[PDB]
Amino acid sequence: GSPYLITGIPKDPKHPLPIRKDIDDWYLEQTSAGSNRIQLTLFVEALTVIQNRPLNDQLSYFRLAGIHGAPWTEWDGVPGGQKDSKGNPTGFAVHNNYTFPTWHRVYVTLYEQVIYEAMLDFIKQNVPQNGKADWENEAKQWRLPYWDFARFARHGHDNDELRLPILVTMPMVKVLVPGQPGKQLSKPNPLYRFQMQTLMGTLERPYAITSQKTEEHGWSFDLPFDKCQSTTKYGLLENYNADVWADGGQNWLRANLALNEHPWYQNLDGWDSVPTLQDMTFRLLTTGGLNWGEFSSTRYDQAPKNWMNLEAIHNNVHNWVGGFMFSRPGRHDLKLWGAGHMSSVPVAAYDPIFWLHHCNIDRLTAIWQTVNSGSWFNDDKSKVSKDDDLRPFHRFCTRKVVFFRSDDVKDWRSLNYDYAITKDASRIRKEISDLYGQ
Protein backbone atom coordinates (compact mmCIF):
# COMPACT_ATOMS: atom_id res chain seq x y z
CA GLY A 1 0.00 0.00 0.00
CA SER A 2 0.82 3.66 0.54
CA PRO A 3 2.99 5.26 1.04
CA TYR A 4 5.19 3.11 -1.20
CA LEU A 5 8.75 3.82 -0.11
CA ILE A 6 11.33 4.00 -2.87
CA THR A 7 14.68 2.70 -1.77
CA GLY A 8 16.20 0.91 -4.71
CA ILE A 9 16.79 -2.80 -4.50
CA PRO A 10 17.65 -3.84 -0.93
CA LYS A 11 21.30 -4.24 0.02
CA ASP A 12 22.72 -7.74 0.36
CA PRO A 13 26.35 -7.74 1.59
CA LYS A 14 27.22 -10.55 -0.82
CA HIS A 15 25.92 -8.40 -3.69
CA PRO A 16 27.85 -5.14 -3.39
CA LEU A 17 26.59 -2.37 -5.70
CA PRO A 18 25.40 -4.43 -8.67
CA ILE A 19 25.65 -2.76 -12.06
CA ARG A 20 23.08 -1.66 -14.58
CA LYS A 21 24.42 -3.18 -17.81
CA ASP A 22 24.23 -2.21 -21.46
CA ILE A 23 21.03 -3.91 -22.60
CA ASP A 24 22.59 -5.27 -25.82
CA ASP A 25 25.57 -6.78 -23.97
CA TRP A 26 23.22 -8.10 -21.29
CA TYR A 27 20.88 -9.67 -23.86
CA LEU A 28 23.76 -11.23 -25.82
CA GLU A 29 25.19 -12.65 -22.61
CA GLN A 30 21.82 -14.02 -21.42
CA THR A 31 21.24 -15.81 -24.73
CA SER A 32 24.75 -17.32 -24.95
CA ALA A 33 25.53 -20.93 -24.06
CA GLY A 34 27.63 -19.84 -21.09
CA SER A 35 24.66 -18.19 -19.34
CA ASN A 36 21.85 -19.72 -17.31
CA ARG A 37 19.36 -17.28 -18.97
CA ILE A 38 17.75 -16.63 -15.58
CA GLN A 39 17.94 -12.82 -15.54
CA LEU A 40 16.33 -12.55 -18.97
CA THR A 41 13.60 -14.93 -17.87
CA LEU A 42 13.01 -13.01 -14.65
CA PHE A 43 12.86 -9.61 -16.41
CA VAL A 44 10.43 -10.88 -19.04
CA GLU A 45 8.21 -12.74 -16.58
CA ALA A 46 8.16 -9.92 -14.00
CA LEU A 47 7.48 -7.15 -16.52
CA THR A 48 4.68 -9.24 -18.05
CA VAL A 49 3.06 -9.58 -14.61
CA ILE A 50 3.44 -5.84 -13.98
CA GLN A 51 1.90 -5.01 -17.36
CA ASN A 52 -1.09 -7.28 -16.67
CA ARG A 53 -1.90 -5.77 -13.25
CA PRO A 54 -5.20 -3.87 -13.12
CA LEU A 55 -5.65 -0.10 -13.22
CA ASN A 56 -6.51 0.13 -9.55
CA ASP A 57 -3.09 -1.37 -8.74
CA GLN A 58 -0.75 1.61 -8.52
CA LEU A 59 2.21 -0.70 -9.24
CA SER A 60 0.72 -1.79 -12.57
CA TYR A 61 2.70 -0.76 -15.66
CA PHE A 62 -0.06 1.61 -16.79
CA ARG A 63 -0.15 3.41 -13.44
CA LEU A 64 3.66 3.61 -13.21
CA ALA A 65 3.86 5.07 -16.72
CA GLY A 66 0.94 7.32 -15.68
CA ILE A 67 3.14 9.06 -13.09
CA HIS A 68 5.00 10.81 -15.88
CA GLY A 69 2.09 12.40 -17.83
CA ALA A 70 -1.38 11.46 -19.06
CA PRO A 71 -3.87 10.57 -17.81
CA TRP A 72 -2.70 12.94 -15.02
CA THR A 73 -4.20 11.04 -12.09
CA GLU A 74 -3.15 10.62 -8.47
CA TRP A 75 -0.36 8.24 -7.52
CA ASP A 76 0.57 6.99 -4.02
CA GLY A 77 -1.96 9.35 -2.43
CA VAL A 78 -0.47 12.42 -4.13
CA PRO A 79 -3.12 14.26 -6.18
CA GLY A 80 -2.96 14.61 -9.95
CA GLY A 81 -4.88 17.05 -12.13
CA GLN A 82 -2.01 19.55 -12.19
CA LYS A 83 -1.76 22.30 -14.75
CA ASP A 84 1.10 23.89 -16.71
CA SER A 85 1.85 27.61 -16.74
CA LYS A 86 0.15 27.47 -20.14
CA GLY A 87 -2.99 26.23 -18.35
CA ASN A 88 -2.62 22.77 -19.82
CA PRO A 89 -2.76 19.40 -18.07
CA THR A 90 0.65 18.28 -16.83
CA GLY A 91 2.02 15.33 -14.89
CA PHE A 92 4.50 14.82 -12.08
CA ALA A 93 7.52 14.59 -14.38
CA VAL A 94 9.97 17.48 -14.34
CA HIS A 95 10.95 18.93 -17.69
CA ASN A 96 12.62 22.24 -18.45
CA ASN A 97 14.03 22.60 -14.93
CA TYR A 98 17.33 21.76 -13.26
CA THR A 99 15.69 18.92 -11.32
CA PHE A 100 15.07 17.10 -14.61
CA PRO A 101 17.91 14.59 -14.02
CA THR A 102 17.12 13.98 -10.35
CA TRP A 103 13.35 13.56 -10.73
CA HIS A 104 14.01 10.98 -13.45
CA ARG A 105 16.76 9.28 -11.35
CA VAL A 106 14.11 8.50 -8.75
CA TYR A 107 11.51 7.49 -11.37
CA VAL A 108 13.85 4.96 -13.02
CA THR A 109 14.68 3.54 -9.59
CA LEU A 110 10.99 3.09 -8.77
CA TYR A 111 10.55 1.08 -11.98
CA GLU A 112 13.64 -1.09 -11.26
CA GLN A 113 12.44 -1.69 -7.67
CA VAL A 114 8.92 -2.76 -8.70
CA ILE A 115 10.39 -5.15 -11.27
CA TYR A 116 12.70 -6.67 -8.67
CA GLU A 117 9.81 -7.21 -6.25
CA ALA A 118 7.84 -8.93 -8.99
CA MET A 119 10.85 -11.15 -9.74
CA LEU A 120 10.83 -12.31 -6.11
CA ASP A 121 7.12 -13.08 -6.39
CA PHE A 122 7.71 -15.05 -9.60
CA ILE A 123 10.40 -17.11 -7.91
CA LYS A 124 8.24 -17.93 -4.89
CA GLN A 125 5.44 -19.21 -7.09
CA ASN A 126 7.19 -20.84 -10.08
CA VAL A 127 10.70 -22.07 -9.22
CA PRO A 128 11.37 -25.54 -7.75
CA GLN A 129 12.30 -25.21 -4.09
CA ASN A 130 15.90 -26.37 -4.61
CA GLY A 131 16.42 -23.75 -7.31
CA LYS A 132 14.94 -20.74 -5.53
CA ALA A 133 18.19 -19.70 -3.89
CA ASP A 134 19.95 -19.64 -7.26
CA TRP A 135 17.12 -17.70 -8.89
CA GLU A 136 17.00 -15.27 -5.96
CA ASN A 137 20.74 -14.64 -6.32
CA GLU A 138 20.19 -13.77 -9.97
CA ALA A 139 17.37 -11.36 -9.08
CA LYS A 140 19.72 -9.73 -6.58
CA GLN A 141 22.41 -9.28 -9.25
CA TRP A 142 19.97 -7.89 -11.80
CA ARG A 143 19.62 -4.17 -12.35
CA LEU A 144 17.63 -2.25 -14.98
CA PRO A 145 19.73 -2.33 -18.18
CA TYR A 146 20.38 0.91 -20.05
CA TRP A 147 20.04 1.58 -23.76
CA ASP A 148 23.31 3.13 -24.97
CA PHE A 149 21.85 5.31 -27.71
CA ALA A 150 25.31 6.80 -28.40
CA ARG A 151 27.32 3.54 -28.76
CA PHE A 152 27.74 1.79 -32.12
CA ALA A 153 25.94 -1.56 -32.04
CA ARG A 154 27.87 -4.80 -32.29
CA HIS A 155 27.91 -6.25 -35.79
CA GLY A 156 29.92 -9.48 -35.63
CA HIS A 157 33.65 -9.99 -36.08
CA ASP A 158 34.27 -10.56 -39.79
CA ASN A 159 33.16 -7.31 -41.39
CA ASP A 160 29.24 2.41 -37.40
CA GLU A 161 25.51 2.39 -36.70
CA LEU A 162 23.51 3.44 -33.63
CA ARG A 163 20.56 1.11 -33.06
CA LEU A 164 17.54 0.49 -30.86
CA PRO A 165 18.24 -2.45 -28.50
CA ILE A 166 18.16 -5.91 -30.01
CA LEU A 167 15.54 -7.03 -27.53
CA VAL A 168 13.32 -3.98 -28.10
CA THR A 169 13.03 -4.94 -31.78
CA MET A 170 11.87 -8.55 -31.13
CA PRO A 171 8.09 -9.22 -30.99
CA MET A 172 8.68 -12.53 -29.17
CA VAL A 173 11.37 -13.67 -26.71
CA LYS A 174 12.35 -17.14 -25.45
CA VAL A 175 12.58 -17.71 -21.72
CA LEU A 176 13.32 -20.66 -19.46
CA VAL A 177 10.73 -23.00 -18.04
CA PRO A 178 12.01 -23.22 -14.44
CA GLY A 179 13.30 -26.72 -13.54
CA GLN A 180 13.35 -27.96 -17.16
CA PRO A 181 16.79 -27.65 -18.70
CA GLY A 182 16.82 -27.35 -22.48
CA LYS A 183 13.20 -26.26 -22.74
CA GLN A 184 12.40 -22.70 -23.67
CA LEU A 185 9.05 -21.03 -24.31
CA SER A 186 8.52 -18.19 -26.76
CA LYS A 187 6.35 -15.43 -25.25
CA PRO A 188 5.22 -11.98 -26.28
CA ASN A 189 8.06 -9.62 -25.46
CA PRO A 190 7.01 -7.02 -22.86
CA LEU A 191 9.84 -4.67 -23.96
CA TYR A 192 8.59 -4.56 -27.61
CA ARG A 193 5.50 -2.42 -26.86
CA PHE A 194 2.77 -1.90 -24.30
CA GLN A 195 -0.91 -2.35 -25.12
CA MET A 196 -4.20 -2.31 -23.26
CA GLN A 197 -7.14 -4.63 -24.07
CA THR A 198 -9.08 -1.77 -25.67
CA LEU A 199 -8.30 1.56 -27.34
CA MET A 200 -6.63 3.65 -24.67
CA GLY A 201 -9.14 6.48 -25.14
CA THR A 202 -11.92 4.16 -23.87
CA LEU A 203 -10.40 3.12 -20.55
CA GLU A 204 -12.62 3.52 -17.45
CA ARG A 205 -12.61 7.02 -15.91
CA PRO A 206 -10.32 8.61 -14.83
CA TYR A 207 -7.68 6.70 -16.83
CA ALA A 208 -8.59 7.31 -20.49
CA ILE A 209 -5.73 8.56 -22.68
CA THR A 210 -6.73 11.56 -24.75
CA SER A 211 -5.41 12.84 -28.02
CA GLN A 212 -2.48 15.21 -27.49
CA LYS A 213 -1.78 18.48 -29.29
CA THR A 214 1.32 18.96 -31.35
CA GLU A 215 2.50 21.77 -33.65
CA GLU A 216 3.95 20.88 -37.07
CA HIS A 217 4.88 23.51 -39.67
CA GLY A 218 2.99 26.14 -37.72
CA TRP A 219 -0.23 24.12 -37.55
CA SER A 220 -1.90 22.35 -34.61
CA PHE A 221 -2.67 18.62 -34.95
CA ASP A 222 -4.22 16.10 -32.56
CA LEU A 223 -1.90 13.13 -32.18
CA PRO A 224 -4.49 10.35 -31.91
CA PHE A 225 -3.20 8.50 -28.86
CA ASP A 226 -6.82 7.93 -27.79
CA LYS A 227 -7.22 5.74 -30.91
CA CYS A 228 -4.23 3.49 -30.08
CA GLN A 229 -4.53 0.12 -28.36
CA SER A 230 -0.75 -0.33 -28.55
CA THR A 231 2.17 2.04 -28.24
CA THR A 232 3.83 2.67 -31.62
CA LYS A 233 7.11 3.98 -33.03
CA TYR A 234 6.34 6.06 -36.18
CA GLY A 235 3.03 4.31 -36.94
CA LEU A 236 0.63 7.28 -36.66
CA LEU A 237 0.29 9.14 -39.98
CA GLU A 238 -2.34 11.69 -40.98
CA ASN A 239 -4.99 10.52 -43.49
CA TYR A 240 -4.59 6.86 -42.56
CA ASN A 241 -7.58 4.77 -41.47
CA ALA A 242 -7.88 4.82 -37.68
CA ASP A 243 -7.80 1.01 -37.64
CA VAL A 244 -4.12 1.30 -38.53
CA TRP A 245 -3.64 3.65 -35.55
CA ALA A 246 -4.93 0.99 -33.19
CA ASP A 247 -1.54 -0.62 -33.54
CA GLY A 248 0.76 1.24 -35.92
CA GLY A 249 3.71 -1.06 -35.34
CA GLN A 250 7.25 -0.91 -33.96
CA ASN A 251 8.89 0.68 -37.01
CA TRP A 252 12.38 0.24 -35.68
CA LEU A 253 14.15 0.69 -39.02
CA ARG A 254 12.87 4.28 -39.17
CA ALA A 255 13.92 4.92 -35.59
CA ASN A 256 17.41 3.64 -36.42
CA LEU A 257 17.50 5.83 -39.52
CA ALA A 258 16.63 8.87 -37.40
CA LEU A 259 19.27 8.09 -34.79
CA ASN A 260 21.96 7.96 -37.49
CA GLU A 261 20.73 10.92 -39.56
CA HIS A 262 20.36 12.99 -36.34
CA PRO A 263 17.87 15.61 -37.49
CA TRP A 264 18.40 17.96 -34.53
CA TYR A 265 15.41 20.21 -33.81
CA GLN A 266 17.74 23.07 -32.85
CA ASN A 267 19.00 25.79 -35.14
CA LEU A 268 22.70 24.98 -35.61
CA ASP A 269 23.45 28.23 -37.43
CA GLY A 270 27.09 29.21 -36.90
CA TRP A 271 28.09 25.81 -35.50
CA ASP A 272 31.53 24.56 -36.56
CA SER A 273 29.96 21.29 -37.63
CA VAL A 274 26.75 19.28 -37.31
CA PRO A 275 27.65 16.57 -34.76
CA THR A 276 26.29 13.08 -34.89
CA LEU A 277 24.41 11.76 -31.83
CA GLN A 278 27.55 9.95 -30.65
CA ASP A 279 29.70 13.09 -31.01
CA MET A 280 27.09 15.26 -29.27
CA THR A 281 27.09 12.75 -26.40
CA PHE A 282 30.91 12.77 -26.34
CA ARG A 283 30.85 16.58 -26.10
CA LEU A 284 28.30 16.52 -23.27
CA LEU A 285 30.63 14.32 -21.21
CA THR A 286 33.89 16.05 -22.03
CA THR A 287 33.28 19.81 -22.33
CA GLY A 288 34.86 21.39 -19.25
CA GLY A 289 33.87 24.46 -17.31
CA LEU A 290 30.10 23.86 -17.19
CA ASN A 291 27.89 24.30 -14.14
CA TRP A 292 25.02 22.03 -13.06
CA GLY A 293 22.38 24.35 -14.49
CA GLU A 294 24.04 24.44 -17.94
CA PHE A 295 24.47 20.63 -18.06
CA SER A 296 21.11 19.61 -16.65
CA SER A 297 18.32 21.43 -18.48
CA THR A 298 17.00 23.44 -21.36
CA ARG A 299 15.95 25.97 -18.69
CA TYR A 300 19.38 27.57 -18.53
CA ASP A 301 18.76 29.16 -21.93
CA GLN A 302 21.89 33.08 -27.99
CA ALA A 303 22.55 29.52 -26.81
CA PRO A 304 25.94 27.83 -26.63
CA LYS A 305 27.23 26.38 -29.91
CA ASN A 306 29.05 23.09 -30.60
CA TRP A 307 27.56 21.26 -27.63
CA MET A 308 24.14 20.54 -26.18
CA ASN A 309 22.82 20.00 -22.65
CA LEU A 310 21.57 16.64 -21.34
CA GLU A 311 17.88 17.47 -21.61
CA ALA A 312 18.20 18.75 -25.16
CA ILE A 313 19.95 15.57 -26.31
CA HIS A 314 17.28 13.53 -24.49
CA ASN A 315 14.55 15.51 -26.24
CA ASN A 316 15.98 14.72 -29.67
CA VAL A 317 16.42 11.03 -28.89
CA HIS A 318 12.76 10.89 -27.78
CA ASN A 319 11.62 12.41 -31.08
CA TRP A 320 13.85 10.12 -33.11
CA VAL A 321 12.69 6.96 -31.38
CA GLY A 322 8.97 7.71 -31.39
CA GLY A 323 8.53 9.62 -34.64
CA PHE A 324 7.89 13.34 -34.67
CA MET A 325 5.99 13.96 -37.93
CA PHE A 326 2.29 13.06 -37.99
CA SER A 327 1.40 15.18 -41.02
CA ARG A 328 2.98 14.33 -44.39
CA PRO A 329 6.20 16.35 -44.80
CA GLY A 330 8.04 17.40 -47.96
CA ARG A 331 9.69 14.96 -50.37
CA HIS A 332 13.05 14.86 -48.66
CA ASP A 333 11.61 14.04 -45.24
CA LEU A 334 9.27 11.26 -46.37
CA LYS A 335 11.93 8.78 -45.29
CA LEU A 336 11.22 9.75 -41.64
CA TRP A 337 7.44 10.29 -41.78
CA GLY A 338 5.37 9.07 -38.86
CA ALA A 339 4.53 9.79 -35.21
CA GLY A 340 4.48 7.71 -32.05
CA HIS A 341 4.40 7.70 -28.28
CA MET A 342 8.05 8.41 -27.42
CA SER A 343 7.91 11.84 -29.11
CA SER A 344 5.09 13.12 -26.87
CA VAL A 345 5.71 13.96 -23.20
CA PRO A 346 2.18 13.04 -22.04
CA VAL A 347 2.45 9.44 -23.32
CA ALA A 348 6.14 8.57 -23.86
CA ALA A 349 6.45 6.53 -20.64
CA TYR A 350 3.98 3.93 -21.99
CA ASP A 351 6.60 2.72 -24.52
CA PRO A 352 8.85 0.28 -22.62
CA ILE A 353 11.96 1.77 -24.30
CA PHE A 354 11.26 4.96 -22.30
CA TRP A 355 12.75 3.40 -19.16
CA LEU A 356 15.87 2.11 -20.95
CA HIS A 357 16.49 5.53 -22.51
CA HIS A 358 16.04 7.20 -19.14
CA CYS A 359 18.37 4.62 -17.60
CA ASN A 360 21.10 5.87 -19.95
CA ILE A 361 20.19 9.50 -19.18
CA ASP A 362 20.79 8.57 -15.53
CA ARG A 363 24.12 7.00 -16.51
CA LEU A 364 25.19 10.11 -18.46
CA THR A 365 24.32 12.16 -15.38
CA ALA A 366 26.39 9.87 -13.15
CA ILE A 367 29.34 10.09 -15.56
CA TRP A 368 29.09 13.87 -15.74
CA GLN A 369 28.93 14.13 -11.93
CA THR A 370 32.02 11.94 -11.68
CA VAL A 371 34.13 14.25 -13.85
CA ASN A 372 32.46 17.45 -12.52
CA SER A 373 32.18 16.63 -8.83
CA GLY A 374 32.00 20.24 -7.57
CA SER A 375 28.96 21.12 -9.71
CA TRP A 376 25.59 20.36 -8.08
CA PHE A 377 22.73 22.87 -7.88
CA ASN A 378 25.16 25.56 -6.87
CA ASP A 379 25.14 28.14 -9.61
CA ASP A 380 22.88 31.18 -9.38
CA LYS A 381 20.26 29.67 -11.67
CA SER A 382 19.92 26.06 -10.52
CA LYS A 383 20.31 26.67 -6.78
CA VAL A 384 16.71 27.81 -6.37
CA SER A 385 15.29 24.43 -7.46
CA LYS A 386 17.59 22.36 -5.26
CA ASP A 387 15.11 21.62 -2.46
CA ASP A 388 12.02 21.05 -4.62
CA ASP A 389 10.01 18.05 -3.47
CA LEU A 390 10.27 15.38 -6.17
CA ARG A 391 6.59 14.47 -5.99
CA PRO A 392 5.13 11.92 -5.93
CA PHE A 393 8.07 9.86 -4.66
CA HIS A 394 8.16 9.02 -0.94
CA ARG A 395 11.12 8.01 1.21
CA PHE A 396 11.69 7.45 4.94
CA CYS A 397 13.64 10.07 6.94
CA THR A 398 12.90 12.26 11.58
CA ARG A 399 11.09 8.89 11.59
CA LYS A 400 8.75 10.47 9.03
CA VAL A 401 7.87 9.71 5.46
CA VAL A 402 8.74 12.68 3.22
CA PHE A 403 9.15 13.48 -0.48
CA PHE A 404 12.46 12.76 -2.19
CA ARG A 405 14.71 15.75 -2.74
CA SER A 406 17.57 16.09 -5.21
CA ASP A 407 20.26 15.90 -2.53
CA ASP A 408 18.99 12.46 -1.50
CA VAL A 409 20.03 11.02 -4.87
CA LYS A 410 23.22 12.95 -5.59
CA ASP A 411 25.00 9.71 -4.76
CA TRP A 412 23.15 7.24 -6.97
CA ARG A 413 24.93 4.44 -5.07
CA SER A 414 22.65 5.17 -2.11
CA LEU A 415 19.92 3.55 -4.25
CA ASN A 416 22.08 0.38 -4.46
CA TYR A 417 23.05 0.38 -8.11
CA ASP A 418 26.05 1.51 -10.10
CA TYR A 419 27.35 1.61 -13.69
CA ALA A 420 30.52 -0.13 -14.86
CA ILE A 421 31.85 3.14 -16.26
CA THR A 422 31.46 5.03 -12.97
CA LYS A 423 32.62 2.15 -10.77
CA ASP A 424 36.00 2.28 -12.54
CA ALA A 425 36.51 6.01 -12.13
CA SER A 426 40.23 5.85 -12.83
CA ARG A 427 39.51 4.72 -16.40
CA ILE A 428 36.53 6.99 -16.99
CA ARG A 429 38.02 9.52 -19.40
CA LYS A 430 39.57 6.74 -21.49
CA GLU A 431 36.30 4.83 -21.55
CA ILE A 432 34.39 7.93 -22.67
CA SER A 433 36.86 8.30 -25.53
CA ASP A 434 36.76 4.62 -26.45
CA LEU A 435 32.96 4.53 -26.55
CA TYR A 436 32.06 7.93 -27.94
CA GLY A 437 35.25 9.58 -29.25
CA GLN A 438 35.48 10.10 -33.03
Q: Name the residues that contact ligand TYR, by CB under 6 A.
A: 265, 315, 318-319, 343-345, 348
Annotated ligand binding at 332? The verdict is no
Nearer CB in complex with a second copy: 216/247: 247
Contact 326, 237 (CB under 8 A): yes
CB of 320 to a second copy, least distance (A): 14
CB of 401 to a second copy, least distance (A): 43
Annotated ligand binding at 318? The verdict is yes
SS (H, E, C) 288-309: CCCCHHHHHCHHHCCCCCCCCC
Q: Which does 169 bind (CB under 5 to 8 A by kind): ligand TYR, a second copy, none?
A: a second copy
CB of 154 to ligand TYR, least distance (A): 28
For residue 337, state whether it binds a second copy (rule: CB under 8 A). yes
For residue 30, state whether it binds a second copy (rule: CB under 8 A). no
Annotated ligand binding at 314? The verdict is yes
For residue 220, state whether it binds a second copy (rule: CB under 8 A). no
Residues 160-199 that bind a second copy (CB under 8 A): 160-161, 166, 169-173
CB of 186 to a second copy, least distance (A): 8
Nearer CB in complex with a second copy: 328/427: 328
CB of 337 to a second copy, least distance (A): 7
Contact with a second copy (CB under 8 A) among 56, 129, 130, 159: 159
Question: With CB under 8 A as the contact rule, which of the stretches 63-71, 104-112, 211-219, 230-238 interacts with a second copy?
Answer: 230-238
How far is CA 218 from its chain centroid?
Answer: 29
Q: Which does 318 bind (CB under 5 to 8 A by kind): ligand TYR, a second copy, none?
A: ligand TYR
Q: Which does 398 bind (CB under 5 to 8 A by kind): ligand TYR, a second copy, none?
A: none
Q: Which does 56 bind (CB under 5 to 8 A by kind): a second copy, ligand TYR, none?
A: none
Annotated ligand binding at 104? The verdict is yes
Helix axes 353-371, 428-436, angle to 10 degrees: 130
Annotated ligand binding at 358? The verdict is yes
Nearer CB in complex with a second copy: 37/410: 37
Residue 193: other Cβ atoms inside 10 A: 22
Contact with a second copy (CB under 8 A) among 241, 273, 302, 426: 241
The closest alpha carbon to 320, from 360, 261, 271, 378, belongs to: 261
Q: State the Cα angle at 414 between 410 and 415, rounded to 5°.
A: 100
For residue 63, state whether it binds a second copy (rule: CB under 8 A). no
Q: Which does 83 bind (CB under 5 to 8 A by kind): ligand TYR, a second copy, none?
A: none
Alpha-carbon torsion angle 245, 247, 250, 251, nearest 10: -30
Nearer CB in complex with a second copy: 59/170: 170
Nearer CB in complex with a second copy: 211/251: 251
Nearer CB in complex with ligand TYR: 169/315: 315
Q: Which does 253 bind (CB under 5 to 8 A by kind): a second copy, ligand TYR, none?
A: a second copy
Interaction site with a second copy (CB under 8 A): 27-28, 31, 155-156, 159-161, 166, 169-173, 229, 234-235, 237-241, 243-244, 246-247, 249-254, 257, 260-261, 328, 334-335, 337-338
Binding residues for Cu(2+): 68, 95, 104, 314, 318, 358
Binding residues: 68, 95, 104, 314, 318, 358
